Amino acid sequence: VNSFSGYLKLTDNVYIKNADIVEEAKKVKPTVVVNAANVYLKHGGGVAGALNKATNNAMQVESDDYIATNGPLKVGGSCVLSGHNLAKHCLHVVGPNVNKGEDIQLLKSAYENFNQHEVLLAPLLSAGIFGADPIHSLRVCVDTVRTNVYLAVFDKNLYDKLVSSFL
Numbered sequence: 001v002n003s004f005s006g007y008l009k010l011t012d013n014v015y016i017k018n019a020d021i022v023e024e025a026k027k028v029k030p031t032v033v034v035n036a037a038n039v040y041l042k043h044g045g046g047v048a049g050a051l052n053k054a055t056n057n058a059m060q061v062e063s064d065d066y067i068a069t070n071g072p073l074k075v076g077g078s079c080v081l082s083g084h085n086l087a088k089h090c091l092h093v094v095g096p097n098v099n100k101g102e103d104i105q106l107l108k109s110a111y112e113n114f115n116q117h118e119v120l121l122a123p124l125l126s127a128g129i130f131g132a133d134p135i136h137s138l139r140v141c142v143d144t145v146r147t148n149v150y151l152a153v154f155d156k157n158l159y160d161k162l163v164s165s166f167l
């Protein structure tokens with residue numbers, strides 16, 4: 001039993017809710033919140049820009065030190081950093097950005113990072129400003145993640161379409 005509330009159950013291990021991941025994180029304080037990161041951990045917009053703003057830019061400060069030490073992530077890769085005031089940990093995961101020409105096949109690799117964590121709050125990777133089809137992102141998620149994932153979809157209209165079209 002965990003403290004996630006109001007989610008529709010899609011499969012044995014995948015749940016979905018129309019919610020602002022920032023507000024969800026602030027309420028639940030999950031062990032892991034997933035960020036829709038880029039390789040440079042530049043949290044300018046989308047989910048990443050919103051999560052960083054909620055940390056008062058502390059996420060960006062930590063991220064800049066990480067990059068200065070380690071260099072950029074791989075597309076499809078991840079790193080674990082602090083969750084600041086939102087969660088114990090933030091798993092920064094880089095899904096392909098279609099608006100940069102990045103291979104959508106790397107989306108499965110991106111979701112594989114979730115399997116290193118027993119429970120996660122997460123957005124749909126590569127959705128929104130990353131330019132992938134969120135219906136496709138959901139299918140890959142369900143077919144790849146085996147740990148317990150609670151998906152927050154900010155857009156209510158998108159939430160309804162994902163549920164109604166889910167196979």
Ligand SMILES: O[C@@H]1CN(c2ncnc3[nH]ccc23)C[C@H]1F
Nearest residue numbers: 021047050123127128129152154
């Ligand atoms: O529409 C897609 C999904 N997405 C979000 N998903 C969940 N919570 C959120 N909070 C702020 C943004 C946001 C950003 C965009 F890439």
